[PDB]
Design a protein around this ligand. Structure first.
Ligand SMILES: *c1ccc([N+](=O)[O-])cc1C(=O)Nc1ccc(-c2nc3cc(C)ccc3o2)cc1
Lengths: 265, 14
C-alpha cells in the first residue's frame, strides 16, 4: 500500500512530465540514433560545414560577444522555464506552497533542469541545435579561440557521465521533481513542507530506480551525486563571466558560431 | 527589460 502509493506518485509525475515537455529524452535520442521518420540533422564539424549550414545578424563588438551570448541563451530559455513551471504545478503539494516559495524554488531550480535537458541533446561527439535539425561537434566547439572553446566542454563532460546512467523519461520526471523541491534554496520562508514533499519524492525515486533498473549498482546514489554536479555546474557559470571581462583580447567569433551558442546553456 | 526571471515564473504560476 505504501509501495502502491509510491508507484502511483511516479506515474502521476510521468504523465504530468509528458504533458508539460514536448521535447522528451526519447525524442532527442530518436533523432540522435536515426529511428526517426525524417532526414537526419546537418553536421557542423568545421568552418566549411559551418558556412555550408544555414538552417536558422547585426555586427557584434569585441568585448561584448560573450555577454551577448549568455544573455541571448538565457532569453531563449524562457519557453523551457515556462514548461518547467507548468510541470512544477503538477507536483503534489507544490501549489499549496507559499507563492513566494514556489517562485524561489523555480528561480534556482530551473537552471539545474535546463542542464538535464541539455544532456538529452548531447552525446560524446556533439550536441543537437536549431530545433534538432543541426548537430554541432564537440571537437569543433573545443577547438574555438579562448575563452569560447572552454564554454561547452564541461557540459559535455557532465552529459557523458549523466547519460551513462541510462535514465529514461519516467526516471527523469521524478529526478526533476526532486531538484525543484530543494529545501535549501536561499530565502525560503517555510521549509518544513518542502523537505516533506521532497522526502516522499525521494522514496518514489528509490522505488522507480529499483523497478526500472533492477540490474544497476548504486544507481540511486549515483543519480543523487549528479545534483551536486549540476549545482556545481550552475555555481560555476559565473567563473566564466569573469574570465571574459579580462581575457587576452580579442573575442571575435564568427556570427554563425555566436548564433549556435545561443542555443546552448 | 527590468523584468527578470522571477516575473516569467510568477506569470507562469498565475
Ligand atoms: C548561454 C549559452 C552558452 C553558455 N555557455 O557556457 O556556452 C552559457 C549560457 C548561459 O548563459 N548559461 C547560464 C546562465 C545563467 C545561469 C544561472 N542563472 C542563475 C540564477 C539563479 C538565481 C541561480 C542560478 C543561476 O544559474 C546558468 C547558466
Amino acid at each position: 500500500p505504501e509501495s502502491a502509493d509510491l508507484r502511483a506518485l511516479a506515474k502521476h509525475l510521468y504523465d504530468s512530465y509528458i504533458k508539460s515537455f514536448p521535447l522528451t529524452k526519447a525524442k532527442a535520442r530518436a533523432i540522435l540514433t536515426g529511428k526517426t521518420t525524417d532526414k537526419s540533422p546537418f553536421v557542423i564539424y568545421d568552418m566549411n560545414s559551418l558556412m555550408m549550414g544555414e538552417d536558422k545578424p547585426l555586427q557584434e563588438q569585441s568585448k561584448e560577444v560573450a555577454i551577448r551570448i549568455f544573455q541571448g541563451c538565457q532569453f531563449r530559455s524562457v519557453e523551457a522555464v515556462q514548461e518547467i513551471t507548468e510541470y512544477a504545478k503538477s507536483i503534489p503539494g507544490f501549489v499549496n506552497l507559499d507563492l513566494n516559495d514556489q517562485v524561489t524554488l523555480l528561480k534556482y531550480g530551473v537552471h539545474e533542469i535546463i542542464y538535464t535537458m541539455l544532456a538529452s541533446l548531447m552525446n560524446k561527439d556533439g550536441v543537437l541545435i536549431s530545433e534538432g535539425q543541426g548537430f554541432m561537434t564537440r571537437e569543433f566547439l573545443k577547438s574555438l579561440r579562448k575563452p569560447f572553446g572552454d564554454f561547452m566542454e564541461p557540459k559535455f563532460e557532465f552529459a557523458v557521465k549523466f547519460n551513462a546512467l541510462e535514465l529514461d523519461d519516467s526516471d527523469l520526471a521524478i529526478f526533476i521533481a526532486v531538484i525543484i523541491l530543494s529545501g535549501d534554496r536561499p530565502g525560503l520562508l517555510n521549509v518544513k513542507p518542502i523537505e516533506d514533499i521532497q522526502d516522499n519524492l525521494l522514496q518514489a525515486l528509490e522505488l522507480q530506480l529499483k523497478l526500472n533498473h533492477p540490474e544497476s549498482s548504486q544507481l540511486f546514489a549515483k543519480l543523487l551525486q549528479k545534483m551536486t554536479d549540476l549545482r556545481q555546474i550552475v555555481t560555476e557559470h559565473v567563473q566564466l563571466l569573469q574570465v571574459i571581462k579580462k581575457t587576452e583580447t580579442d573575442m571575435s567569433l564568427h556570427p554563425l558560431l555566436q548564433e549556435i551558442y545561443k542555443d546552448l546553456y | 527589460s527590468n523584468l527578470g526571471l522571477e516575473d516569467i515564473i510568477r506569470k507562469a504560476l498565475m
